[PDB]
Amino acid sequence: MRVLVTGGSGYIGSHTCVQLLQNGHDVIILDNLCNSKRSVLPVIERLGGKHPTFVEGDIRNEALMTEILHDHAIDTVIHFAGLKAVGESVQKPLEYYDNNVNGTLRLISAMRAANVKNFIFSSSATVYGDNPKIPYVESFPTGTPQSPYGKSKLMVEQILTDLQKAQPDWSIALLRYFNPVGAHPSGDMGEDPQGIPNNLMPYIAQVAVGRRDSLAIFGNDYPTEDGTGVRDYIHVMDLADGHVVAMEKLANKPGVHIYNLGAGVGNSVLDVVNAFSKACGKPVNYHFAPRREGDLPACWADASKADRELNWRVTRTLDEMAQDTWHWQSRHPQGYPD
Amino acid sequence: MRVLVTGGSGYIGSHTCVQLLQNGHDVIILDNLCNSKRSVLPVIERLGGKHPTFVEGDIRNEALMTEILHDHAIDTVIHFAGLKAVGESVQKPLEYYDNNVNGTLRLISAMRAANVKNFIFSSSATVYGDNPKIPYVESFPTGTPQSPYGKSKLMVEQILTDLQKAQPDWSIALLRYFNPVGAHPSGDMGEDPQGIPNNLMPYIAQVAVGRRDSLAIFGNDYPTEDGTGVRDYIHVMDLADGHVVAMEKLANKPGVHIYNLGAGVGNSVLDVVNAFSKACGKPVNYHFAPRREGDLPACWADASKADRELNWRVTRTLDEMAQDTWHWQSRHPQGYPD
Ligand SMILES: NC(=O)c1ccc[n+]([C@@H]2O[C@H](COP(=O)([O-])OP(=O)(O)OC[C@H]3O[C@@H](n4cnc5c(N)ncnc54)[C@H](O)[C@@H]3O)[C@@H](O)[C@H]2O)c1
Ligand SMILES: NC(=O)c1ccc[n+]([C@@H]2O[C@H](COP(=O)([O-])OP(=O)(O)OC[C@H]3O[C@@H](n4cnc5c(N)ncnc54)[C@H](O)[C@@H]3O)[C@@H](O)[C@H]2O)c1
Ligand SMILES: O=c1ccn([C@@H]2O[C@H](COP(=O)(O)OP(=O)(O)O[C@H]3O[C@H](CO)[C@@H](O)[C@H](O)[C@H]3O)[C@@H](O)[C@H]2O)c(=O)[nH]1
Ligand SMILES: O=c1ccn([C@@H]2O[C@H](COP(=O)(O)OP(=O)(O)O[C@H]3O[C@H](CO)[C@@H](O)[C@H](O)[C@H]3O)[C@@H](O)[C@H]2O)c(=O)[nH]1
Ligand code: NA
Ligand code: NA
Ligand code: NA
Ligand code: NA
């Protein structure tokens, strides 16, 4: 198929793109480069064994979107473009609502105009908000997310939902997940965060690499097996894979197809650290801190539906998430070149 | 003060504008005229005993907003601009999210740029969603509205809230209400709906006037005193008044000031019809229909807070809502001239 991948050069998008090309689809990447570099492009092409078209631009530019759409005869769109830093979202809420909410709106409005009706939304498990029932299942109603980031994701979920309802020929997937981790097995692509990493894994990696002194673990008194918080971590390759199957199987199947993507189990902070110490050959440094405010002791997603309906499940392990991450750090200590 | 009233030429805005001028503020009306006519302008000026500045334009035009802001040295903004037809919102959800959600976002983004930090949002009681606890109080958490219209209102409420939180010097009022009815006592301004009126009152009026044959009443079996649905109706003059006091008293008082504006009581469909038959001098024609889907038997807002905090309460009666409405119909059977 002909797919427009917004946010194509990002962490998730990059890996998705590689898997897309490998499956032989024609890929058009639309990215404003606000959080990625052109330098990943050639990597994608190489790893994908095929050339993707790149367009520098912004989802908020409805006119350009339309143009793209038409120009490339897009059949479907995978939308990864947006801001995703939670703390920053609390500080800069307007930028989050404009990039996520308005940005998707402008994107779908252009699809409407270009006659495109297959969409895959890279969503978020924050949409379940504060549900005490875990693991979370697609059949649980959503809750009220705590940051502007989370709120923005749900708002887009609702708008897409209403749209489909008004334009019932549309096929829209809402892919929910938590923590993408790892890197391509080649060690030639991976997460390249600028500044202090918000996510555990990359933080760990940086500490390990010697850029950070020690990991502060928020709380050691949860009602968890080891006392640290339990989260859901998904290898970026599996997630990319989930994105492709979803795209491929849902195309032209009218509806709002909601799926949680994850391993189906949780892993504690210590488990993540130990797996990491294991990958990098040395004990990761850490210390305890107090519960970070708004944290649940444990949380994870039930991924039965995706298994059943898309015949999709993860295949990478926590250890692999670690190795691969350390592998990319090790081969490209400076990340993507400028 | 210097006030920008977006949606200034609309039903609510027009009346608000008149009361603003009477209090001697300087008024700038920004309206795209999508649902109003320039012809109301001179009425406003006359009734207000003062000249308001009019700018034709769209809230979604961030650049123009900014310009206005600066140009007129705005101190505060009353935002009435948006789409508000529920049924249409289900049919055309994107237009609702773009006008309401993006439109407010662009508006507040321009305020940010122009350094304006006093805002009065003309909200909606739909935000309480399906609460079985009535009357609704500002202290009740919000629920999930049922249409894109309702959803859009809540989303804007949330964005404004987050913004204030990030920019704590802002003063933002979220004014919630239900059914504005009536017209200026002069009979020279009032609601001028194009097409089939969605609201009860105007529908009634049209039937009465001979444009409509009969009113269909949805359900006669509710757990209400007379069996018909109980709603909350507020005279447009009182509501306008609430908008002005809010503006005047809240200016520069940092926070998110939430207030329900209403009479504090509910009135049934029959009560509304009888008051109308009474105003127009003849029995309004009606018939019963089945419960319209998604309707509660009764619903109304508690307006104690506004009384207490702003010393505001309504002063017009249901009968007056009717008379005034019939009065405007009677003096301007064709509404505003083209
Ligand atoms: N990484 C996570 O922990 C996390 C968890 C939940 C959901 N997501 C979602 O997945 C998506 C992809 O995130 P990611 O992890 O790959 O982050 P990422 O920043 O690496 O990728 C996003 C890409 O989009 C681009 N972009 C941002 N705003 C844009 C705009 N207006 N127009 C065009 N391009 C724009 C950035 O340049 C970047 O390359 C986002 O929707 C994010 O909300 C990620
Ligand atoms: N009337 C009701 O029953 C109801 C109940 C709840 C809330 N409200 C809210 O009050 C506000 C005013 O509504 P109203 O009853 O006076 O309706 P209205 O349509 O008469 O007034 C709205 C005005 O805004 C203008 N407008 C619409 N979209 C615009 C945009 N993008 N840019 C600039 N101008 C634009 C229209 O031309 C119109 O004059 C809206 O926010 C509405 O959601 C009204
Ligand atoms: O320096 C750190 C970083 C994280 N943690 C812990 O590591 C676990 C995982 O933390 P984090 O990366 O923040 O995971 P999540 O809380 O699972 O947050 C992710 O999933 C959410 C859905 O609930 C989204 O809001 C976010 O964008 C996303 O990063 C948690 O128990 C944290 O307390 C630490 O102890 N120290
Ligand atoms: O032809 C008609 C029109 C209305 N009604 C009834 O009249 C009452 C009032 O109806 P309506 O004008 O639709 O009032 P609300 O249901 O109170 O809706 C208003 O308040 C809501 C907040 O819950 C918003 O979603 C809407 O924009 C707004 O018009 C209800 O019991 C209706 O069933 C009839 O019987 N026949
Ligand atoms: Na429809
Ligand atoms: Na670098
Ligand atoms: Na802040
Ligand atoms: Na007319």
PDB file of N, CA and C in Angstrom, chain B residues 29-77:
ATOM      1  N   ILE B  29     -16.124  44.307  18.662  1.00  0.00           N
ATOM      2  CA  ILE B  29     -16.842  43.084  18.366  1.00  0.00           C
ATOM      3  C   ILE B  29     -16.082  42.386  17.266  1.00  0.00           C
ATOM      4  N   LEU B  30     -15.730  41.086  17.451  1.00  0.00           N
ATOM      5  CA  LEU B  30     -15.065  40.323  16.392  1.00  0.00           C
ATOM      6  C   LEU B  30     -16.046  39.221  15.982  1.00  0.00           C
ATOM      7  N   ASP B  31     -16.574  39.199  14.754  1.00  0.00           N
ATOM      8  CA  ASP B  31     -17.518  38.157  14.370  1.00  0.00           C
ATOM      9  C   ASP B  31     -17.349  37.798  12.914  1.00  0.00           C
ATOM     10  N   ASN B  32     -17.452  36.515  12.564  1.00  0.00           N
ATOM     11  CA  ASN B  32     -17.286  36.156  11.176  1.00  0.00           C
ATOM     12  C   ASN B  32     -18.568  36.175  10.412  1.00  0.00           C
ATOM     13  N   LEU B  33     -19.603  36.528  11.135  1.00  0.00           N
ATOM     14  CA  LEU B  33     -20.895  36.617  10.520  1.00  0.00           C
ATOM     15  C   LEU B  33     -21.436  35.326   9.962  1.00  0.00           C
ATOM     16  N   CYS B  34     -20.905  34.224  10.412  1.00  0.00           N
ATOM     17  CA  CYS B  34     -21.425  32.991   9.887  1.00  0.00           C
ATOM     18  C   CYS B  34     -22.796  32.709  10.401  1.00  0.00           C
ATOM     19  N   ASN B  35     -23.162  33.326  11.529  1.00  0.00           N
ATOM     20  CA  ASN B  35     -24.485  33.038  12.021  1.00  0.00           C
ATOM     21  C   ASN B  35     -25.209  34.276  12.502  1.00  0.00           C
ATOM     22  N   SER B  36     -24.798  35.424  12.013  1.00  0.00           N
ATOM     23  CA  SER B  36     -25.401  36.701  12.374  1.00  0.00           C
ATOM     24  C   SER B  36     -25.270  37.644  11.180  1.00  0.00           C
ATOM     25  N   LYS B  37     -25.879  38.845  11.237  1.00  0.00           N
ATOM     26  CA  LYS B  37     -25.834  39.836  10.161  1.00  0.00           C
ATOM     27  C   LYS B  37     -25.345  41.186  10.654  1.00  0.00           C
ATOM     28  N   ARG B  38     -24.696  41.988   9.785  1.00  0.00           N
ATOM     29  CA  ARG B  38     -24.197  43.329  10.178  1.00  0.00           C
ATOM     30  C   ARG B  38     -25.314  44.240  10.643  1.00  0.00           C
ATOM     31  N   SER B  39     -26.510  43.895  10.202  1.00  0.00           N
ATOM     32  CA  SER B  39     -27.629  44.701  10.528  1.00  0.00           C
ATOM     33  C   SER B  39     -27.915  44.839  12.030  1.00  0.00           C
ATOM     34  N   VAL B  40     -27.366  43.969  12.848  1.00  0.00           N
ATOM     35  CA  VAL B  40     -27.640  44.096  14.281  1.00  0.00           C
ATOM     36  C   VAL B  40     -26.763  45.184  14.889  1.00  0.00           C
ATOM     37  N   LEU B  41     -25.681  45.410  14.190  1.00  0.00           N
ATOM     38  CA  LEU B  41     -24.724  46.369  14.676  1.00  0.00           C
ATOM     39  C   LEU B  41     -25.258  47.717  15.109  1.00  0.00           C
ATOM     40  N   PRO B  42     -25.926  48.365  14.193  1.00  0.00           N
ATOM     41  CA  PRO B  42     -26.474  49.653  14.524  1.00  0.00           C
ATOM     42  C   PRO B  42     -27.457  49.558  15.697  1.00  0.00           C
ATOM     43  N   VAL B  43     -28.110  48.390  15.875  1.00  0.00           N
ATOM     44  CA  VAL B  43     -29.071  48.219  16.942  1.00  0.00           C
ATOM     45  C   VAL B  43     -28.315  48.196  18.215  1.00  0.00           C
ATOM     46  N   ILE B  44     -27.217  47.507  18.168  1.00  0.00           N
ATOM     47  CA  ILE B  44     -26.450  47.471  19.382  1.00  0.00           C
ATOM     48  C   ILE B  44     -26.022  48.848  19.832  1.00  0.00           C
ATOM     49  N   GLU B  45     -25.527  49.583  18.876  1.00  0.00           N
ATOM     50  CA  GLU B  45     -25.045  50.912  19.152  1.00  0.00           C
ATOM     51  C   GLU B  45     -26.134  51.788  19.723  1.00  0.00           C
ATOM     52  N   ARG B  46     -27.291  51.698  19.107  1.00  0.00           N
ATOM     53  CA  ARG B  46     -28.379  52.514  19.539  1.00  0.00           C
ATOM     54  C   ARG B  46     -28.841  52.132  20.933  1.00  0.00           C
ATOM     55  N   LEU B  47     -29.109  50.852  21.119  1.00  0.00           N
ATOM     56  CA  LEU B  47     -29.547  50.359  22.413  1.00  0.00           C
ATOM     57  C   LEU B  47     -28.465  50.591  23.461  1.00  0.00           C
ATOM     58  N   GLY B  48     -27.223  50.468  23.051  1.00  0.00           N
ATOM     59  CA  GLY B  48     -26.171  50.646  24.021  1.00  0.00           C
ATOM     60  C   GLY B  48     -25.859  52.073  24.341  1.00  0.00           C
ATOM     61  N   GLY B  49     -26.302  53.008  23.483  1.00  0.00           N
ATOM     62  CA  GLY B  49     -26.039  54.435  23.633  1.00  0.00           C
ATOM     63  C   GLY B  49     -24.553  54.732  23.480  1.00  0.00           C
ATOM     64  N   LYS B  50     -23.911  53.928  22.670  1.00  0.00           N
ATOM     65  CA  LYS B  50     -22.496  54.092  22.467  1.00  0.00           C
ATOM     66  C   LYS B  50     -22.013  53.205  21.316  1.00  0.00           C
ATOM     67  N   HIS B  51     -20.966  53.638  20.688  1.00  0.00           N
ATOM     68  CA  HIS B  51     -20.448  52.943  19.559  1.00  0.00           C
ATOM     69  C   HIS B  51     -19.349  51.915  19.837  1.00  0.00           C
ATOM     70  N   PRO B  52     -19.666  50.731  19.399  1.00  0.00           N
ATOM     71  CA  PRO B  52     -18.741  49.617  19.498  1.00  0.00           C
ATOM     72  C   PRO B  52     -18.030  49.473  18.161  1.00  0.00           C
ATOM     73  N   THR B  53     -16.792  49.057  18.218  1.00  0.00           N
ATOM     74  CA  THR B  53     -16.030  48.836  17.015  1.00  0.00           C
ATOM     75  C   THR B  53     -16.271  47.423  16.556  1.00  0.00           C
ATOM     76  N   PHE B  54     -16.499  47.270  15.242  1.00  0.00           N
ATOM     77  CA  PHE B  54     -16.731  45.967  14.606  1.00  0.00           C
ATOM     78  C   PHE B  54     -15.669  45.541  13.631  1.00  0.00           C
ATOM     79  N   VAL B  55     -15.224  44.316  13.806  1.00  0.00           N
ATOM     80  CA  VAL B  55     -14.249  43.727  12.948  1.00  0.00           C
ATOM     81  C   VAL B  55     -14.767  42.405  12.435  1.00  0.00           C
ATOM     82  N   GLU B  56     -14.839  42.279  11.121  1.00  0.00           N
ATOM     83  CA  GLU B  56     -15.293  41.027  10.576  1.00  0.00           C
ATOM     84  C   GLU B  56     -14.070  40.091  10.508  1.00  0.00           C
ATOM     85  N   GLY B  57     -14.191  38.883  11.014  1.00  0.00           N
ATOM     86  CA  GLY B  57     -13.037  38.032  11.043  1.00  0.00           C
ATOM     87  C   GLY B  57     -13.342  36.778  11.845  1.00  0.00           C
ATOM     88  N   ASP B  58     -12.333  35.926  11.869  1.00  0.00           N
ATOM     89  CA  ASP B  58     -12.414  34.623  12.436  1.00  0.00           C
ATOM     90  C   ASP B  58     -11.418  34.350  13.537  1.00  0.00           C
ATOM     91  N   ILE B  59     -11.971  33.762  14.606  1.00  0.00           N
ATOM     92  CA  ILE B  59     -11.173  33.424  15.735  1.00  0.00           C
ATOM     93  C   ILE B  59     -10.010  32.528  15.342  1.00  0.00           C
ATOM     94  N   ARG B  60     -10.216  31.748  14.293  1.00  0.00           N
ATOM     95  CA  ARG B  60      -9.162  30.852  13.932  1.00  0.00           C
ATOM     96  C   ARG B  60      -7.970  31.536  13.330  1.00  0.00           C
ATOM     97  N   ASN B  61      -8.115  32.821  13.011  1.00  0.00           N
ATOM     98  CA  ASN B  61      -7.029  33.598  12.391  1.00  0.00           C
ATOM     99  C   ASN B  61      -6.188  34.224  13.490  1.00  0.00           C
ATOM    100  N   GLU B  62      -5.253  33.441  14.020  1.00  0.00           N
ATOM    101  CA  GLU B  62      -4.405  33.863  15.107  1.00  0.00           C
ATOM    102  C   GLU B  62      -3.724  35.228  14.876  1.00  0.00           C
ATOM    103  N   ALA B  63      -3.271  35.456  13.642  1.00  0.00           N
ATOM    104  CA  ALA B  63      -2.595  36.702  13.327  1.00  0.00           C
ATOM    105  C   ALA B  63      -3.491  37.874  13.445  1.00  0.00           C
ATOM    106  N   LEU B  64      -4.717  37.728  12.932  1.00  0.00           N
ATOM    107  CA  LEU B  64      -5.587  38.847  13.016  1.00  0.00           C
ATOM    108  C   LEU B  64      -5.981  39.089  14.467  1.00  0.00           C
ATOM    109  N   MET B  65      -6.142  38.017  15.199  1.00  0.00           N
ATOM    110  CA  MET B  65      -6.513  38.180  16.602  1.00  0.00           C
ATOM    111  C   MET B  65      -5.503  39.018  17.330  1.00  0.00           C
ATOM    112  N   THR B  66      -4.275  38.649  17.095  1.00  0.00           N
ATOM    113  CA  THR B  66      -3.227  39.365  17.766  1.00  0.00           C
ATOM    114  C   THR B  66      -3.248  40.858  17.468  1.00  0.00           C
ATOM    115  N   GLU B  67      -3.476  41.125  16.209  1.00  0.00           N
ATOM    116  CA  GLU B  67      -3.477  42.469  15.699  1.00  0.00           C
ATOM    117  C   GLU B  67      -4.535  43.237  16.429  1.00  0.00           C
ATOM    118  N   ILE B  68      -5.718  42.636  16.490  1.00  0.00           N
ATOM    119  CA  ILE B  68      -6.827  43.289  17.162  1.00  0.00           C
ATOM    120  C   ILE B  68      -6.473  43.648  18.567  1.00  0.00           C
ATOM    121  N   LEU B  69      -5.974  42.610  19.183  1.00  0.00           N
ATOM    122  CA  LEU B  69      -5.628  42.738  20.561  1.00  0.00           C
ATOM    123  C   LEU B  69      -4.780  43.948  20.819  1.00  0.00           C
ATOM    124  N   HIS B  70      -3.720  44.043  20.035  1.00  0.00           N
ATOM    125  CA  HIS B  70      -2.777  45.127  20.162  1.00  0.00           C
ATOM    126  C   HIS B  70      -3.378  46.437  19.774  1.00  0.00           C
ATOM    127  N   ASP B  71      -3.980  46.406  18.619  1.00  0.00           N
ATOM    128  CA  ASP B  71      -4.564  47.592  18.087  1.00  0.00           C
ATOM    129  C   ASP B  71      -5.447  48.272  19.079  1.00  0.00           C
ATOM    130  N   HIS B  72      -6.260  47.496  19.767  1.00  0.00           N
ATOM    131  CA  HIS B  72      -7.228  48.101  20.671  1.00  0.00           C
ATOM    132  C   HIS B  72      -6.881  48.055  22.104  1.00  0.00           C
ATOM    133  N   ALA B  73      -5.675  47.597  22.372  1.00  0.00           N
ATOM    134  CA  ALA B  73      -5.261  47.592  23.753  1.00  0.00           C
ATOM    135  C   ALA B  73      -6.260  46.866  24.641  1.00  0.00           C
ATOM    136  N   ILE B  74      -6.735  45.714  24.188  1.00  0.00           N
ATOM    137  CA  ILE B  74      -7.691  44.955  24.963  1.00  0.00           C
ATOM    138  C   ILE B  74      -7.215  44.601  26.390  1.00  0.00           C
ATOM    139  N   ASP B  75      -8.134  44.694  27.364  1.00  0.00           N
ATOM    140  CA  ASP B  75      -7.791  44.346  28.736  1.00  0.00           C
ATOM    141  C   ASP B  75      -8.330  42.955  29.060  1.00  0.00           C
ATOM    142  N   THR B  76      -9.448  42.649  28.414  1.00  0.00           N
ATOM    143  CA  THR B  76     -10.150  41.413  28.642  1.00  0.00           C
ATOM    144  C   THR B  76     -10.920  41.024  27.393  1.00  0.00           C
ATOM    145  N   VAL B  77     -11.223  39.717  27.310  1.00  0.00           N
ATOM    146  CA  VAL B  77     -11.927  39.160  26.170  1.00  0.00           C
ATOM    147  C   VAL B  77     -13.109  38.271  26.607  1.00  0.00           C
TER     148      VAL B  77
END
